[PDB]
Design a protein around this ligand. Structure first.
Ligand SMILES: *[C@@H]1O[C@H](CO)[C@@H](O[C@@H]2O[C@H](CO)[C@@H](O)[C@H](O)[C@H]2NC(C)=O)[C@H](O)[C@H]1NC(C)=O
Ligand SMILES: *[C@@H]1O[C@H](CO)[C@@H](O[C@@H]2O[C@H](CO)[C@@H](O)[C@H](O)[C@H]2NC(C)=O)[C@H](O)[C@H]1NC(C)=O
Ligand SMILES: *[C@@H]1O[C@H](CO)[C@@H](O[C@@H]2O[C@H](CO)[C@@H](O)[C@H](O)[C@H]2NC(C)=O)[C@H](O)[C@H]1NC(C)=O
Ligand SMILES: *[C@@H]1O[C@H](CO)[C@@H](O[C@H]2O[C@H](CO)[C@@H](O)[C@H](O)[C@H]2NC(C)=O)[C@H](O)[C@H]1NC(C)=O
Ligand SMILES: *[C@@H]1O[C@H](CO)[C@@H](O[C@H]2O[C@H](CO)[C@@H](O)[C@H](O)[C@H]2NC(C)=O)[C@H](O)[C@H]1NC(C)=O
Ligand SMILES: *[C@@H]1O[C@H](CO)[C@@H](O[C@H]2O[C@H](CO)[C@@H](O)[C@H](O)[C@H]2NC(C)=O)[C@H](O)[C@H]1NC(C)=O
Ligand SMILES: *[C@H]1O[C@H](CO)[C@@H](O[C@@H]2O[C@H](CO)[C@@H](O)[C@H](O)[C@H]2NC(C)=O)[C@H](O)[C@H]1NC(C)=O
Ligand SMILES: *[C@@H]1O[C@H](CO)[C@@H](O)[C@H](O)[C@H]1NC(C)=O
Ligand SMILES: *[C@@H]1O[C@H](CO)[C@@H](O)[C@H](O)[C@H]1NC(C)=O
Ligand SMILES: *[C@@H]1O[C@H](CO)[C@@H](O)[C@H](O)[C@H]1NC(C)=O
Ligand SMILES: *[C@H]1O[C@H](CO)[C@@H](O)[C@H](O)[C@H]1NC(C)=O
Ligand SMILES: *[C@H]1O[C@H](CO)[C@@H](O)[C@H](O)[C@H]1NC(C)=O
Ligand SMILES: [Ca+2]
Ligand SMILES: [Ca+2]
Ligand SMILES: [Ca+2]
Ligand SMILES: [Ca+2]
Ligand SMILES: [Ca+2]
Ligand SMILES: [Ca+2]
Lengths: 927, 599
């Protein structure tokens, strides 16, 4: 949460070489001094006819700030014949990616072209160069006999790279197999051992590699980015690679197993063209020894207050749990167009707090696209979503955006202090910067007053000049420091104290320091080894009873301590800082003796009451709950009197009710220093005697499945009076109830059918829909609206089967949508009428032969439903006329439901029941 | 009466006004007083002193009537009524005003044809030769003015996308296909916008295709260029604009250019030149949808995605991200490009959405829309299904939180696409405990509101006691353009279905809803009979907007369509078929001559 930014190390490169485009720390085991690597993809070299081939500069760290280009290859273009070049190196972007594992370092040139031993080409297959000490081999997995774009001719292998714990290489090539993309993993050893200057296409032994796939995937860009880490039981890092164009440009992230290169997990984007995958990172954000995945979408569009679509990019932060599944979250940029997840970069524990931190960069944010890097701290719960720090690129453009942060490496303490460091490169201005972490310092302050309750009269201890006795009291402000890393010894704090801060300006400072006669004294301290809390004492008297008439407002002592800029090593200066969330001032208070009996001590009589008014918290939705507290003091003055309400994890404090004339507008506030969840309410510092007080604390309980019978609150009054300081802890419960508004609905699609009936043919022994009649169709929905859900219900649908051995609505089949299973007491398509291969009015079950369809219902939560889709057929025998008027029929079918079981069982329930009916009226218009 | 103004007045005028616009202050020469100095002039006036007590106000500064026809001599054809109005708000007050938007018929229109010349279009580049004059007429009869242009693109002429340079003799053609095609170009500007709608035909005729290794083209590169180069394309300041983007392929997006080794982002600036060839294609990465919008919007250009079915779904999804953009379904020969531009044109001219450029920080702007005579739908500020020549109305309310620093601070308001607009120069006339607020779920005013004494003073785009309730409707969206599927109202960004027996985030879901027919009956019973409640409500024009076209004797046979039959007031049985598909066209074939009781 704090990197020096005053004077940070500044390195540079040739005008236009893109120095800084790629970075990383070099830490050879053969030496004690680390360096920093900087790729310059567009540099120029002493390479024969190789214009803009690129380079990788090794920078020294030691005031000199020099960088001499690592010599990977001085060789120009090899030949295939006289005049016909075998490879083209000019404009190859060598340095575009640079990782190092130890005494070794990988460096690729993904715009490297090759013409092939076959036909005459110029295919961008790419090539890397692995250096190690002095031996320098050439890695080039995609340059093989498998040429062209439908093969590996356009990989640009080396577009991304990384090493694994067990020392291995992960190389990505976005162009493989019609730009689907490719991943290739080889053993460092095998790479230098199987080398051979005379074999443009080398066969490494245990090489992992993805294979070509169906065409649908063309143009996905696998390998665009890549990171490593373990994602199964145990073992070696598996492979993680982003695929920008994946999906319908929704973009995906693939995580392959590092042993066999088989698929393990996938991640998909949510918004097309956002460029999900542009970047990825593996690192443990919550110190649970389980790696964590970070995916950045530099072009994500979210919405503003006015709800308008805006581009600020986001970073997916998927936390890996022992289960194997991930618990993801999101994080959006702030400035528009800045490209937030444009570059994620793991740091270690940038503050040695015990959890790792991560840096996210918005390459084109701030001032004039000067560039911004936000560093985020990690914590058990997850990754704090509030930038603890902001690195602002301090370099203006000149031909293209500076690009501060487009690249950046961390997790390496290139120096003394046991804290990491960070490299960041702005290739627009051609440069990189190293920010050095400062040593965090944790400090504790103490502050106590000799006599707690100041007695106006009693005054031993005499003044200074005019030897006159006065009522003194002492102050003891002690201090404790020390943190981790490199910094100790020194540590000096400039303190300062004050009496009657509750007064400040406006005189009437009822207290002053002994020999000073001032309402404010100061001093220094010094310490180091944690525990050696060096104290410093002071003496303060109270003004004369006649200079002031205020004797209720407590006299609070205030101490504020701050560090000095001088406790740094000869690191050219590196001042530390104190733990972010840490107060540089504590305060205690004093109370003039007033109305405390005759023994001169105040001992109250506290009591809290709470009637169960609302009493009814329905499980399911968020039920509102308010309780009327009744705090009252029937003894003497209670100092710093305050109501303490211990709230339930299912409840959250809204505020104190004020929409009323009977309740007190208490000044409450919610907090939880100890996993106790509590809201605190001020009842009066001097809290006068016999001070009854009603007030309302309202909030919202959120229950939880099964659980127990009811949620309770705990109330108690705590005061700072040496005696009888608290009250009997009174608890108060509220029962959980069950309410599940369940309802049933139906719709007979054609709520009508006219019998003139557009054509028709009575075909003895029918075989198709049209040979039968039109398609009537009933639909039933059972839905739970009520808050509390249920776990079992019955569905009974009676259906208008026949009226007199004469069929009515011939059911073809039925469907279901939701947790439901149904059964028919009779077979549905007795006539097997496959699809088309080209008591005298209301006919219900009361008066007609019935067909029962029964359905057992699963669990429906609040806002869900199950649905029966019955698809019948109007048997057209609704035809008669030789006998009176064969007309008007109201085909009915009803459906009722019974709720039989909820998942609570320990709470009182009731049986939910209801039904409904749906008709299909058949009639005659041209009768 | 010692109240609000009394309690927070003692201080000085400044704070006295800063309290409520329902207060006042008074005192100059040396006149005494024993009564409060800050009150409601009513409680104050009957106590002497009588002129330092401002009142917010919004004076129109320019009217000019809506006009009824495009360009007709000197009269600056206007489509928005007030154009200028001065606001002068005092501390924490507000002031409502209104705006009128007319779809002025016979308004000049610009049409830039920007086609993809990938080999898969040599054909296409044929059944277009005629088009241009063929266009000129269908357009003519819908606008006494029409200008058209032409543009062509392929992709960045670089290594990955282009044929690097394998045979030295491939930098020139389709060498192995024999055909012999024109080399790669990226984006070329052919015919600048002119009225001589023949130059268009005499142009495409010369045009030839090119070829590209990679599937995805460089269309967006072009789209950006034929949009911010204007002096080139020659769009007309006062006209309706159209960029017909037609392709049968996928498309590169920003960040792809990385491969080609292009990392400088698109600046959205015009980069064409003398040769009319986007001279940055190779040095600048494709533009992102965000830039694309920002510019499409600013320049008032209407992008139309004319694409082939094999890749149509792709572009619908893309436009969903670039709102205001329509998408038609072209063909392999573009043969139907004609009746595509039209349906697009109309479809765009069918709505009016109000947008806000450069609005101040502490200024809040709530809207109310009136688009269907008298019926006002509180909340929205956009309308669709309108007929060219129709007018709509919006009621805007302005409100300041606190008081910034003097300045001609002036923002605008205008319809997306429109040139006209209502400039609004605001001016601010401005010369307990932050602790105990309310708390929604951990934040003071839900982290969306200031906390002054009593309640919270919500931040722009927020409302309510706590300020949890937003002012958004977008979330209430629903693929229909009709918030909440017309099945419910939108309150606080979330729909609350009027429970017709429906549910869903936008009430889209309604399985027990009456037969799809029952709905579309009140439709045919007005457009073909005048009768039915729908004509009574005097609507049946903005709602029932299908295509009721009385069919011959027999009805239809088109599968995937429904039939329906009902009895009319008259007692006869009407037979009709619902049907959806094609351009997304829906029509209601109505058997002609129902069945009535004989006699
Ligand atoms: C690297 O050297 C080259 C070669 O001199 C420089 O570019 C030359 O001149 C123009 C650019 O001004 C190029 O188009 C030519 O291809 C180059 N000529 C030759 C003979 O190679 C280039 O500017 C230098 N690059 C940097 C980053 O300094
Ligand atoms: C992750 O997504 C990829 C691509 O969508 C899946 O890979 C495909 O898997 C199918 C099923 O066997 C194969 O036929 C294809 O060859 C694969 N294509 C590619 C490009 O790999 C992969 O299975 C998904 N993995 C998970 C865990 O969902
Ligand atoms: C089908 O016919 C029946 C009765 O003819 C309708 O059901 C009810 O009928 C009684 C008797 O006249 C009325 O009082 C009720 O108002 C009717 N219920 C309803 C909901 O209208 C039934 O409605 C008819 N179906 C249709 C589509 O009209
Ligand atoms: C069963 O559901 C019905 C709703 O269909 C509830 O009845 C109420 O609403 C009906 C609307 O059709 C009316 O017909 C009823 O008269 C009306 N009755 C009441 C008391 O509101 C009914 O309450 C439900 N049954 C139960 C036990 O809740
Ligand atoms: C935040 O705003 C919401 C907006 O709905 C309010 O929550 C309400 O939720 C239900 C109605 O939608 C009611 O049952 C709740 O009682 C109501 N909340 C309160 C406090 O009454 C609410 O104003 C805000 N939420 C909170 C916790 O204050
Ligand atoms: C309902 O509309 C259908 C339209 O689909 C009419 O049937 C026609 O279309 C069917 C679908 O391909 C074919 O199977 C039918 O053969 C065809 N009709 C003829 C005469 O060929 C149908 O007439 C309408 N039905 C009713 C009852 O109105
Ligand atoms: C020290 O006292 C408080 C901290 O205890 C400082 O005031 C604010 O305290 C809150 C925490 O309750 C922080 O969130 C704020 O950041 C603090 N203010 C600032 C400006 O940082 C207060 O500043 C200090 N008092 C003195 C006299 O220095
Ligand atoms: C690697 O080995 C095989 C190969 O697919 C398979 O079991 C799996 O992908 C990996 N290992 C295990 C134990 O599953
Ligand atoms: C006065 O206060 C009490 C007596 O009430 C006691 O501490 C002592 O007598 C005096 N003060 C001190 C600091 O001792
Ligand atoms: C929204 O609609 C009302 C209609 O009563 C209109 O007066 C105003 O524009 C908005 N309402 C308010 C209170 O501002
Ligand atoms: C019905 O479906 C299957 C029957 O094999 C079963 O697994 C499921 O639990 C049943 N559903 C309900 C709601 O009982
Ligand atoms: C966009 O198109 C439709 C919209 O419903 C749907 O298939 C999906 O949401 C998207 N599909 C694709 C291919 O983008
Ligand atoms: Ca593993
Ligand atoms: Ca973890
Ligand atoms: Ca940390
Ligand atoms: Ca360090
Ligand atoms: Ca006592
Ligand atoms: Ca074609």
């Amino acid at each position: 949460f704090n990197l020096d930014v005053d004077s940070p190390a500044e390195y540079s490169g040739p005008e236009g070489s893109y120095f800084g485009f790629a970075v990383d720390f070099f830490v050879p085991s053969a030496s004690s001094r680390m360096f920093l690597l900087v790729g310059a993809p567009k540099a120029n070299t002493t390479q024969p006819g190789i214009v803009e081939g690129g380079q990788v500069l090794k920078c020294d760290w030691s005031s000199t700030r020099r960088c001499q280009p690592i010599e990977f290859d001085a060789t120009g273009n090899r030949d295939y014949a006289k005049d016909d070049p075998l490879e083209f190196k000019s404009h190859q972007w060598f340095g575009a990616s640079v990782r190092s594992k130890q005494d070794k370092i990988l460096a690729c040139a993904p715009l490297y072209h090759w013409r092939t031993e076959m036909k005459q080409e110029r295919e961008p297959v790419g090539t890397c160069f692995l250096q190690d000490g002095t031996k320098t081999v050439e890695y080039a997995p995609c340059r093989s006999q498998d040429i062209d774009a439908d093969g590996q001719g356009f990989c640009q292998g080396g577009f991304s790279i990384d090493f694994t714990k067990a020392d291995r290489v992960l190389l990505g090539g976005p162009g493989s197999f019609y730009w689907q993309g490719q991943l290739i993993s080889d053993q460092v050893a095998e790479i230098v051992s199987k080398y051979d200057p005379n074999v443009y296409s080398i066969k490494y032994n245990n090489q992992l590699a993805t294979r070509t796939a169906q065409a649908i995937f063309d143009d996905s860009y696998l390998g665009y980015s890549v990171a490593v880490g373990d994602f199964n039981g145990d073992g070696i890092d598996d492979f993680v690679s982003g695929v920008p164009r994946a999906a319908r440009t929704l973009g995906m992230v693939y995580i392959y197993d590092g042993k066999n290169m088989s698929s393990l997990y996938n991640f998909t984007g949510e918004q097309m063209a956002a460029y999900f995958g542009f970047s990825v990172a593996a690192t443990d954000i919550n110190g649970d020894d389980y790696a964590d995945v970070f995916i950045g979408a530099p072009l994500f569009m979210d919405r503003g207050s006015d709800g308008k679509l805006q581009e600020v990019g986001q970073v997916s932060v998927s936390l890996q749990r022992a289960s194997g599944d991930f618990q993801t979250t999101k994080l959006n940029g702030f400035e528009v167009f800045a490209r937030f997840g444009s570059a994620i970069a793991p740091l270690g524990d940038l503050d040695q707090d015990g959890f790792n931190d991560i840096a996210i960069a918005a390459p084109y944010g701030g001032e004039d696209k000067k560039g911004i890097v936000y560093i985020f701290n990690g914590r058990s719960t997850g990754l704090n979503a509030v930038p603890s720090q902001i690195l602002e690129g301090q370099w203006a453009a000149r031909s293209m955006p500076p690009s501060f942060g487009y690249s950046m490496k961390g997790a390496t303490d290139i120096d003394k202090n046991g804290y990491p460091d960070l490299i960041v490169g702005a290739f627009g201005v051609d440069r990189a910067i190293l920010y050095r972490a400062r040593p965090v310092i944790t400090v504790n302050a103490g502050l106590e007053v000799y006599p707690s309750i100041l007695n106006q009269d009693n005054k031993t201890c005499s003044l200074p000049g005019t030897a006159l006795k006065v009522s003194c009291f002492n102050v003891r402000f002690c201090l404790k420091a020390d943190g981790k890393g490199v910094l100790p010894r020194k540590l000096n704090f400039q303190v300062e104290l004050l009496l009657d801060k509750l007064k400040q300006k406006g005189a009437i400072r009822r207290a002053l320091f002994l020999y000073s006669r001032s309402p404010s004294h100061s001093k220094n301290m010094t310490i180091s080894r944690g525990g050696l809390m060096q104290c410093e004492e002071l003496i303060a008297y109270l003004r004369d009873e006649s200079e002031f008439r205020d004797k209720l407002t407590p006299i609070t002592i205030f101490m504020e301590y701050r560090l000095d800029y001088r406790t740094a090593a000869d690191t050219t200066g590196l001042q530390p800082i104190l733990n972010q969330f840490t107060p540089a001032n504590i305060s205690r208070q004093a109370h003039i003796l007033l109305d405390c009996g005759e023994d001169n001590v105040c001992k109250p009589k506290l009591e809290v009451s709470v009637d169960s008014d609302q009493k009814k918290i329905y499980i399911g939705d968020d039920n509102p709950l308010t309780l009327i507290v009744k705090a009252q003091n029937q003894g003497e003055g209670a100092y710093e009197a305050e109501l303490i309400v211990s709230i339930p994890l299912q409840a959250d404090f809204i505020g104190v009710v004020r929409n009323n004339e009977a309740l007190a507008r208490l000044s409450c506030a919610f907090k939880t220093e100890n996993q106790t969840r509590q809201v605190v309410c001020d009842l009066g510092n001097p809290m006068k005697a016999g001070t009854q007080l009603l007030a309302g604390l309202r909030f919202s309980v959120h229950q939880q499945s099964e659980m127990d019978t009811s949620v309770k609150f705990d109330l108690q009054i705590q005061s700072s009076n040496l005696f009888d300081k608290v009250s009997p802890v009174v608890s108060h419960k509220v029962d959980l109830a069950v309410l599940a508004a369940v309802e049933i609905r139906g719709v007979s699609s054609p709520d009508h059918v006219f019998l003139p009936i557009p054509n028709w043919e009575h075909k003895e022994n029918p075989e198709t829909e049209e040979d039968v009649g039109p398609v009537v169709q009933h639909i039933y929905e059972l839905r739970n609206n009520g808050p509390s859900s249920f776990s079992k219900a019955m569905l009974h649908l009676q259906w208008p089967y026949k009226y007199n051995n004469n069929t009515l609505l011939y059911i073809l089949h039925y469907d279901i949508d939701g947790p439901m299973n149904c059964t028919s007491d009779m077979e549905i398509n007795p006539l097997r009428i496959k699809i088309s291969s080209l008591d005298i009015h209301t006919l219900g079950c009361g008066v007609a032969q019935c067909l029962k369809i029964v359905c057992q219902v699963g669990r429906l939560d609040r806002g869900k439903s199950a649905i029966l889709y019955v698809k019948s057929l109007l048997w057209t025998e609704t035809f008669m006329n030789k006998e009176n008027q064969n007309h008007s029929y109201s085909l009915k079918s009803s459906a009722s439901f019974n709720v039989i079981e909820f998942p609570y069982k320990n709470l009182p329930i009731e049986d939910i029941t209801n039904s409904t009916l749906v008709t299909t009226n058949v009639t005659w218009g041209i009768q | 009466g010692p109240n609000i103004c009394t309690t927070r007045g003692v201080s000085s005028c400044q704070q006295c006004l800063a309290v409520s616009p329902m207060c006042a202050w008074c005192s100059d020469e040396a006149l005494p007083l024993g009564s409060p100095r800050c009150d409601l002039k009513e409680n104050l006036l009957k106590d002497n002193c009588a002129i330092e007590f401002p009142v917010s106000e919004a004076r129109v500064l320019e009217d000019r009537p809506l006009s009824d026809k495009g360009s007709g001599d000197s009269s600056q054809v206007t489509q928005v009524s007030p154009q200028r109005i001065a606001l002068r708000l005092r501390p924490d007050d507000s002031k409502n005003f209104s705006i009128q938007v007319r779809q002025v018929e016979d308004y000049p229109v610009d049409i830039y044809y920007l086609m993809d010349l990938s080999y898969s279009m040599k054909d296409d580049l044929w059944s277009i030769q005629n088009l241009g004059t063929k266009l000129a007429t269908q357009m003519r009869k819908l606008t006494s003015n029409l200008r058209i242009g032409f543009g062509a693109f392929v992709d960045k002429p670089v290594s990955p996308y282009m044929y690097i340079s394998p045979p030295e003799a491939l930098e020139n053609p389709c060498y192995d296909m024999k055909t012999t095609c024109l080399p790669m170009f990226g984006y070329k500007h052919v015919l600048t916008l002119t009225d001589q709608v023949t130059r268009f035909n005499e142009e495409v005729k010369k045009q030839s295709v090119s070829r590209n290794r990679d599937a995805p083209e460089g269309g967006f590169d072009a789209i950006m260029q034929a949009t911010v180069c204007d002096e080139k394309i020659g769009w007309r300041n006062d006209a309706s604009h159209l960029l017909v983007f037609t392709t049968d392929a996928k498309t590169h997006i920003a960040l792809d250019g990385r491969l080609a080794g292009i990392v400088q982002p698109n600046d959205g600036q015009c980069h064409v030149g003398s040769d009319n060839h986007y001279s940055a294609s190779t040095t600048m990465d494709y533009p992102s949808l965000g830039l694309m919008t920002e510019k499409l919007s600013q320049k008032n250009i209407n992008l139309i995605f004319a694409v082939t079915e094999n890749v149509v779904n792709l572009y619908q999804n893309y436009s969903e991200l670039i709102p205001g953009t329509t998408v038609g379904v072209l063909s392999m020969d573009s043969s139907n490009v004609l009746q595509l531009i039209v349906d697009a044109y109309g479809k765009i001219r069918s709505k009016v959405e109000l947008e806000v450029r450069d609005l101040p920080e502490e200024l809040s702007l709530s809207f109310n829309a009136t688009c269907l005579n008298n019926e006002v739908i509180p909340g929205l500020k956009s309308c669709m299904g309108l007929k060219i020549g129709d007018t709509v109305s919006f009621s805007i309310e302005a409100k300041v939180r606190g008081c910034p620093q003097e300045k001609e601070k002036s923002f605008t308001i205008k319809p997306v696409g429109f040139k006209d607009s209502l400039i609004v120069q605001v001016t601010f006339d401005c010369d307990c405990d932050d602790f105990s607020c309310v708390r929604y779920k951990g934040e003071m005013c839900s982290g969306h509101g200031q906390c002054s004494c009593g309640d919270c003073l919500c931040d722009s785009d927020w409302t309510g006691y706590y300020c949890n309730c937003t002012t958004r409707t977008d979330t209430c969206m629903s693929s229909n353009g009709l918030l909440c599927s017309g099945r419910g109202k939108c309150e606080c960004g979330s729909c609350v279905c009027i429970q017709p027996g429906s549910y869903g985030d936008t009430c889209e879901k309604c399985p027990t809803c009456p037969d799809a027919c029952t709905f579309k009956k009140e439709c045919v019973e007005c457009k073909k009979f005048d009768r039915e409640p729908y004509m009574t409500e005097n609507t049946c024009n903005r709602y029932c907007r299908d295509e009721i076209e009385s069919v011959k004797e027999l009805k239809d046979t088109g599968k995937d369509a429904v039939n329906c039959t009902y009895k009319n007031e008259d007692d006869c049985v009407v037979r009709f078929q619902y049907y959806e598909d094609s351009s997304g066209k829906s029509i209601l074939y109505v058997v002609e001559e129902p069945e009535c009781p004989k006699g």
